[PDB]
Design a protein around this nucleic acid. Structure first.
Ligand SMILES: [Mg+2]
Ligand SMILES: [Zn+2]
Ligand SMILES: [Zn+2]
Ligand SMILES: [Zn+2]
Lengths: 66, 51, 113, 185, 436, 49, 204, 133, 263, 97
RNA sequence: AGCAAUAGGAGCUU
């Protein structure tokens, strides 16, 4: 839905890295290198960011009913 | 409506919306109305022509 | 709907003691201690501290059920020594070791700057 | 000594590649689909909309039902169309097929994983499982909490379950690109 | 509802009297029911979705009836096959096999924890098997601590000597293990084992407490030892792969020779059996023996540290066929007793040619699960698994009908005080029960 | 309704395994332990409790 | 929120329920401090022969280390050996084993543990949707027996096979008590002459 | 204070089946036909072929609840390198002068042949074995 | 006798070698830093107007998972030991979040930096959500479209990681010892040779490999422990380590107190 | 010798056959030829064969009881409604089945 | 101090 604040397995804060990860992906860097620069070294933390699907963009498209 | 017996049941079912793949599978399901009155295991078998 | 509260691990009730001592009558000079609201962190530390004393003949612990936050410890000592005094001795020794460890860590951290 | 043509409604059918089988040209025995067709599909138009139906109408893919399937010889992969000259203790031994001197293939599978359905397509490496476990997963994957629709907030149903933090799988099948499992995990 | 109340506990279907047994209550959070793991066999239960029913007796007569007739300790031995039905299972078995190996030694602190973990320990620390240069206990000593005293058991496995080079057989003297790995043959549900002996000598209560003692000791040891299984435990080295593939190729050549003999009309038929049925029987024999030989090669290749081998040797899960199918060869699939039929016209699949009787065409899977099945082998294995699922789904109704009719036929039959076996009409069925 | 019937004072839920229970012990959820009941006649040995 | 008794499965027929939950510090850890979300039992692989489960764990570990998604399409030319080569090139034991430590003691485990990511599913069967108890409640109008249904606060059926098991046990009083005092017990008056329930009774 | 003193020459050592345990065979150097088979911990007392072992069997170490030994006390085991405790589970007063004794050292097994006049006093409940070199 | 040798030391993580201590001590320290070091986290959320697409308890969970500066949290009291009714100023920190999207194009992101500390036991340096830098935008909390609004009053309280993971000051405490398996505490699975098939520990070069002529030692215990503490910014690495030590000290002092005052 | 089909009386008479040991797997034939006790023996043999085929072992007394109920009246009583409900027991038992 | 029935369909564990 939206990027989780913590890593499930260990608890590192990944919620402040989703925008940086997307910016890294625009200039062409592949996912492993972007995850390296954000200093996600354990594969638990890495799969936290690498497997996120951002569904809030899809949910926000339906007009607010208030 | 007055001939509910001798009519096929379960031809229409409530669309399964539990998850997306369940919906996609329910929309592609098939039913042979042989019925359970009868222990012929032959029509229940995966067959070569099913490939 | 049957899940107990996550704070009963550490909040001691008023009717529940922290510690309760009963003697093991089968062998001489042995006692059974139940620690309520503790877990492996204190148990293993105390057990491996006490296991290295000459006057301690038996020391062990268990957590009978993981869904309940306590452990029970059996401790036997030789004739002259009392298991309680050895327990205070082990606690004091670990406290002193931790104080020395803290002092050395702080000095090292200052030097690293 | 019969010739049966069917135009009935309700027959189940599946597409196959068409191996060139006319025994008169150097193009005999290999797939009629080439790299120009894939270039056209990626482009989206022919070089004087190019989609699936253009392949079907150009004679490189056709549909076959169960009855027509009786008369054809389907190659499993595009490599099976030619006998190789190996010895890999890790990769699985593609069957010897030594009894027959010369194979005359008429069709090729587009991809063998397409024999599976929607629910079985989620399974990773289903060819490493005993079949009852694949069946149990085909049943159980329909009971898995996810995001059934993106407009679940303007719908009013008797029951609905939405996972807080859906994640796409680290091990994924090609079919899930078409099943949207990575878009709505 | 309070602790130690007897309640009747039950899982459907209730096929025999030990599917519904009376248990003592212990109140717990976390809305599931909790069961000791050795009673899951009489219930035929596992923990992947199952639900079980609990019935509360509402009077003292029913409390006493439950506790004195239906209690779990009283049902350990069954009259169906005069053997125990509750055993040591599913991790305690593997752990006790690993713990009672000859080269398993334990230091003093872990020994102390294991002794304190035993509910029936008498507070006496056993002497270590080794006193110098370092006190070491063997796993056999710690397991013998669990067994009650006054128990003697002796078993011979393939004529082993009293010095047991293989650590096979079993000797128990006054409750102490002298030699022998402790595995399914000692703590399983088979007759004559340790559970049966303790049940017969000490009673149901001590035999019930034996399960708990062994479970606790072995579970602690395995918690601090560890046990796993990985993709590497199903992989055989290159030389064994060469042996396995050579055996499979030899069997394929043998089958091709049988096919040649059948096609040029020189095969020797068998009584009451057709030439085509003789050909099929000989081919099935050949392929079954091929799979068995490849499996034997794979089993001999496995080290003693192989986790699949440890589980199989303990007898707690899996067998030789499982090892064979994972590492060497899945083998031949059968649908309705025969090989894979020609569902298409003269062939099994439309990727084969007409009248092809080779093993691959008619349902022989040459690969292992580790190596991966081909699409054809995958489809044939799917047909076989579907046949199995249909059988399981369909025969249970006939079986339930048969058992209901048997129960109604025999429901009114009781042994009377004069020894006779009579029905409700008073008619004699047997003059003495069981003739003994 | 005669060979078999529905009964009061019964419960049902998923089962779990517990290595730390005795063989003849069953772990009962608190909610079920409070929903179900046993009638205990008052006597001069159990009146305080 | 997931709790004890909720049903979970991986994509290879490996279903199971949560038996217990452990906190971060209680779970076994690798030398890098990674701890598992989930610990399944080794005894589910051998007799079930779900090799794809282990292969998919290995592939997922490699994919998460190298930052892409592993391709697990069936009937491809991928092998366990290639995956193990990648994993070893990434500095990990090639078979997915890791040296892990006991959470309770920090001591190394004598055996190595198969460790890595796996895609699990949250199935609709929750214990809180199934747990039901009934002391006394509504009965049916016609039969005056406990109603049917968890939602209706019904009772459990003590069917014929339960009666067979109680008969085998020889518990006659318990059977009478299940079928009478735990169900539709009634009182009727019969005629001592005609034996019919045609007796008009005015108890007051 | 010992029951059976002797010196043995190790003949074969099959490490083989296990990793911390090896079975050894040895005939007495002074009195042949006395055979000794013994399981020993490799990591605590490694033994090679043709080595010479002084082997003692004793009913006690003095000169019921096990407690770790202090440095200050003394026992018979002070003069040896490898001490094990075991249970006699078979005493075979068999053929003419073949006498076999079986001792189980917590699952590590021992057999000892020889004439009756050597092993007559080896008919006990529990036996210590002590080894040098 | 215990010794510390710091190998790397920055604000978020410290990598140190611990020596001349028992393994139980080192593991108790690891466990204490993971589970029993108090921090500050939002434990009570009050929704005034939430017209965003996200649900109320979704947002509440995310807000509870936000790291807050907890340097002075030890001079604070647990909300269960204060005489006060509904939160006072000395056992709680009150935060406000107000966000709103005006216009009919674009999306307004609501970040953790938008949380504003209103009250709290001053002048204690607690309560603020942790920012990595001066230019940090913080954690993503929600997204807002036209006329959608979020009005929230969060309360922050003192707690430990036993009750809930949001109070954990640490992410991952790497921990190992004996890189060369001299003690034989593990027993390596292998196919051909256990030395070729197993990668070296990252502290392998910190200890001498065993010599081929060497025999096994049955006197050696574990004596050197290499551990790498990481934090979430709520506490600093030296602060996490020192307060874990102090928490362990006070747990032992509590045991000693109960023992002495049980006479 | 093993055969297909059944004619017990005539094969028992043929010279060269051990007339005291010929056996049939159809115990109705045994009853018509050899009597009811031999029928009980044959019935037990068949039931033991069916159970012990796969290595299962059922204690003797259970199968003995089953064959004694089936041969108690002098003739073979099948486990069916046609057998159970032709007894002289009470009406409520028979109706309950 | 009182919460319908009958059907069909889809599922759970054997
Ligand atoms: Mg089940
Ligand atoms: Zn992480
Ligand atoms: Zn009348
Ligand atoms: Zn306050």
């Amino acid at each position: 839905m939206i990027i989780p604040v913590r890593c499930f397995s260990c608890g590192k804060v990944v919620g402040d890295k989703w925008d940086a990860y997307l910016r890294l992906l625009e200039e062409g860097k592949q996912e492993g290198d972007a995850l390296d620069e954000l200093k996600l070294k354990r594969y638990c933390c890495r799969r936290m960011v690498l497997t996120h699907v951002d569904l809030i963009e899809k949910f926000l498209r339906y007009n607010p009913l208030e | 409506q007055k001939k509910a017996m001798s009519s096929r049941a379960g031809v229409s079912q409530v669309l399964n919306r539990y998850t997306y793949s369940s919906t996609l599978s329910h929309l592609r399901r098939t039913n042979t109305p042989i019925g359970r009155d009868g222990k012929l295991a032959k029509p229940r078998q995966l067959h070569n022509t099913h490939w | 709907m049957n899940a107990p509260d996550r704070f009963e691990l550490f909040i001691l009730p008023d009717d529940v003691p922290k510690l309760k001592i009963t003697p093991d009558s089968r062998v001489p000079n042995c006692i059974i201690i139940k620690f309520e609201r503790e877990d492996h962190t204190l148990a293993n530390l105390l057990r491996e501290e006490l296991a290295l004393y000459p006057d301690v003949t038996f020391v062990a612990y268990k957590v009978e059920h993981p869904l309940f936050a306590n452990f029970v410890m059996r401790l036997q000592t030789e004739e002259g020594t009392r298991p309680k005094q050895a327990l205070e001795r082990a606690c004091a020794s670990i406290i002193n070791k931790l104080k020395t460890l803290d002092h050395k860590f702080n000095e090292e951290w200052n030097i690293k700057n | 000594r019969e010739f049966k043509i069917f135009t009935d409604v309700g027959r189940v059918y599946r597409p196959l590649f068409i191996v060139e089988d006319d025994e008169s040209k150097d193009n005999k025995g290999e797939l009629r689909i080439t790299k120009e067709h894939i270039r056209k599909i990626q482009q989206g138009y022919d070089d004087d909309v190019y989609g699936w139906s253009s392949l079907v109408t150009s004679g490189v893919i056709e549909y076959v039902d169960g009855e027509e399937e009786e008369t054809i010889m389907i190659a499993m992969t595009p490599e099976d169309l030619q006998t190789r000259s190996l010895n890999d203790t890790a990769k699985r031994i593609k069957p010897e097929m030594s009894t027959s001197s010369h194979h005359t293939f008429t069709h090729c599978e587009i991809h063998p994983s397409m024999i599976l359905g929607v629910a079985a397509s989620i399974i990773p490496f289903p060819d490493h499982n005993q079949s009852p476990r694949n069946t149990y997963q085909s049943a159980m994957g329909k009971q898995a909490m996810g995001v059934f629709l993106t407009n679940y907030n303007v719908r009013m149903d008797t029951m609905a379950n939405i996972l807080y933090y859906p994640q796409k799988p680290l091990a994924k099948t090609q079919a899930m690109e078409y099943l949207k499992f990575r878009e709505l995990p | 509802l309070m602790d130690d109340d007897p309640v009747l506990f039950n899982r459907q279907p209730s096929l025999h009297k030990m599917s519904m047994m009376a248990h003592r209550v212990k109140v717990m959070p976390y809305s599931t029911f909790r069961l000791n793991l050795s009673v899951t066999s009489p219930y035929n239960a596992d923990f992947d979705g199952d639900e079980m029913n609990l019935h509360v007796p509402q009077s003292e007569e029913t409390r006493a009836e439950l506790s004195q007739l239906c209690a779990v300790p009283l049902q350990i031995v069954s009259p169906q096959s005069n053997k125990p039905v509750m055993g040591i299972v599913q991790d305690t078995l593997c752990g006790v096999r690993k713990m009672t190996l000859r080269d398993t030694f334990i230091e003093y602190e872990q020994v102390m924890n294991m002794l304190f973990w035993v509910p029936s320990w008498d507070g006496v620390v056993p002497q270590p098997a080794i006193l110098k240069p370092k006190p070491l206990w063997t796993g056999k000593q710690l397991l013998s601590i669990a067994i009650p005293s006054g128990i003697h058991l002796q078993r011979t496995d393939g004529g082993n000597s009293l010095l047991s080079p293989k650590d096979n057989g079993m000797l128990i003297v006054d409750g102490k293990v002298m030699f022998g790995v402790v595995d399914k043959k000692t703590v399983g549900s088979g007759g004559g084992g340790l559970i049966h002996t303790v049940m017969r000598e000490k009673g149901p209560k001590i035999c019930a407490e034996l399960f708990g003692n062994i479970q606790k000791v072995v579970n602690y040891w395995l918690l601090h030892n560890g046990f796993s299984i990985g993709i590497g435990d199903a992989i055989a080295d290159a030389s064994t792969m060469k042996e396995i593939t050579h055996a499979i190729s030899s069997a394929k050549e043998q089958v091709q020779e049988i096919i040649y003999k059948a096609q040029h009309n020189e095969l020797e038929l068998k009584p009451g059996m057709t030439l085509r049925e003789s050909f099929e029987g000989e081919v099935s024999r050949t392929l079954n023996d091929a799979r068995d030989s490849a499996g034997r090669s794979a089993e001999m290749n496995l080290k003693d540290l192989n986790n699949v081998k440890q589980m199989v040797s303990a007898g707690s899960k899996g067998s030789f066929i499982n090892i064979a199918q994972m590492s060497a060869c899945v083998g031949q699939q059968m649908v309705e007793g025969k090989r894979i039929a020609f569902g298409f016209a003269d062939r099994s699949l439309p990727h084969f040619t007409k009248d092809d009787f080779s093993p691959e065409s008619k349902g022989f899977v040459e690969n292992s699960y580790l190596r991966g099945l081909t699409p054809q082998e995958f489809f044939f294995h799917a047909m076989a698994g579907r046949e199995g699922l249909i059988d399981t789904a369909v025969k249970t109704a006939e079986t339930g009908y048969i058992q209901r009719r048997l129960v109604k036929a025999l429901e009114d039959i009781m042994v009377h005080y004069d020894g006779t076996t009579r029905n409700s009409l008073g008619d004699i069925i047997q003059f003495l029960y069981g003739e003994d | 309704n005669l060979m078999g019937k529905r009964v009061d004072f019964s419960a049902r839920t998923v089962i779990s395994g517990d290595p730390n229970l005795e063989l003849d012990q069953v772990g009962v959820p608190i909610s079920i332990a409070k929903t179900l009941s046993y009638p205990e006649t008052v006597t001069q040995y159990n009146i305080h409790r | 929120v997931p709790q004890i008794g909720d049903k979970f499965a991986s994509r290879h027929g490996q279903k199971g329920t949560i038996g217990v939950t452990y906190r971060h510090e209680d779970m076994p850890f690798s030398a890098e401090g990674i701890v598992p979300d989930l610990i399944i039992n080794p005894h589910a692989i051998p007799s079930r022969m779900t090799v794809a489960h282990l292969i998919e764990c290995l592939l997922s570990k490699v994919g998460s280390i190298r930052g892409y998604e592993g391709d697990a399409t069936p009937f491809t030319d991928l092998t366990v050996d290639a995956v193990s080569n990648l994993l070893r090139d990434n500095g990990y034991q090639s078979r997915g084993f890791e040296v892990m430590y006991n959470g309770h003691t920090g001591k190394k485990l004598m055996a190595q543990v198969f460790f890595g990511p796996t895609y699990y599913q949250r199935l609709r069967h929750m214990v809180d949707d199934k747990i039901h108890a009934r002391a006394r409640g509504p009965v049916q109008v016609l039969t005056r027996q406990p109603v049917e249904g968890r939602s209706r606060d019904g009772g459990l059926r003590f069917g014929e096979m339960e009666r067979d098991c109680m008969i085998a046990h020889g518990a006659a009083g318990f059977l009478k008590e299940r079928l009478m005092e735990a169900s539709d017990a009634f009182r009727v008056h019969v005629c001592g002459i005609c034996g019919l329930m045609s007796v008009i009774a005015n108890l007051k | 204070s010992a029951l059976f003193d002797d010196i043995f020459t190790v003949q074969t050592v099959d490490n083989g089946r296990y990793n911390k345990v090896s079975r050894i065979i040895g005939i007495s150097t002074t009195n042949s036909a006395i055979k000794l088979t013994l399981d020993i911990n490799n990591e605590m007392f490694p033994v090679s072929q043709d080595d010479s072992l002084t082997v003692t069997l004793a009913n006690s170490l003095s000169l019921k609840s096990w407690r770790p030994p202090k440095p200050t006390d003394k026992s018979l085991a002070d003069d040896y390198d490898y001490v094990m405790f075991g249970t006699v589970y078979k005493f075979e007063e068999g053929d003419e002068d073949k006498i076999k004794v079986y001792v189980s050292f917590g699952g590590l097994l021992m057999c000892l042949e020889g004439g009756y006049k050597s092993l007559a006093s080896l008919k006990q409940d529990n036996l210590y074995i002590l080894i040098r070199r | 006798e215990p010794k510390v040798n710091i190998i790397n030391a920055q604000d978020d993580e410290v990598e140190l070698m611990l020596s001349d201590v028992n393994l139980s001590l080192a593991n108790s320290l690891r466990r204490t830093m993971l589970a029993e070091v108090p921090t500050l986290a939002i434990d009570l959320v009050e929704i005034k107007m939430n017209t965003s697409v996200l649900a109320d308890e979704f947002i509440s969970h995310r807000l509870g998972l936000i790291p807050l500066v907890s340097e002075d949290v030890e001079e604070m009291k647990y909300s269960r030991d204060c005489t006060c009714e509904d939160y006072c100023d000395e056992c709680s920190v009150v935060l406000e979040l107000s966000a709103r999207h005006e216009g009919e194009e674009g999306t307004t992101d609501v970040y953790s930096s938008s949380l504003i500390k209103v009250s709290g036991p001053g002048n204690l340096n607690v309560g603020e959500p942790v920012r990595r830098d001066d230019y940090d935008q913080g954690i993503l909390l929600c997204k807002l479209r036209n006329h959608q609004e979020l009005n929230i009053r969060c309360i922050a309280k003192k707690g430990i990681a036993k009750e809930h993971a949001k109070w954990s000051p640490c992410s991952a405490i790497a921990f190992e010892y004996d890189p060369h398996n001299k003690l034989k505490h593990t027993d390596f699975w292998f196919e051909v040779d256990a030395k070729k098939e197993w990668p070296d520990s990252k502290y392998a070069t910190w200890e001498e490999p065993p010599k081929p002529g060497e025999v096994f030692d049955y006197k050696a215990k574990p004596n050197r422990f290499y551990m790498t503490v990481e934090t979430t910014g709520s506490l600093k690495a030296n602060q996490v380590f020192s307060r874990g030590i102090k928490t362990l000290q006070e747990k032992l002092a509590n045991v000693l107190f109960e023992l002495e005052n049980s006479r | 010798l093993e055969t297909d089909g059944i004619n017990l009386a005539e094969v028992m008479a043929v010279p060269g056959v051990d007339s005291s040991r010929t056996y049939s797997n159809s115990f109705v034939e045994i009853l018509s030829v050899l009597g009811i006790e031999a029928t009980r023996s044959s019935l037990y043999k068949e039931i033991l064969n069916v159970i012990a085929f796969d290595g299962s072992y059922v204690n003797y007394r259970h199968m003995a009881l089953l064959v004694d109920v089936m041969t108690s009246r002098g003739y073979l009583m099948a486990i069916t409604r046609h057998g159970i409900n032709r007894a002289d027991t009470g009406a409520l038992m028979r109706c309950s089945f």
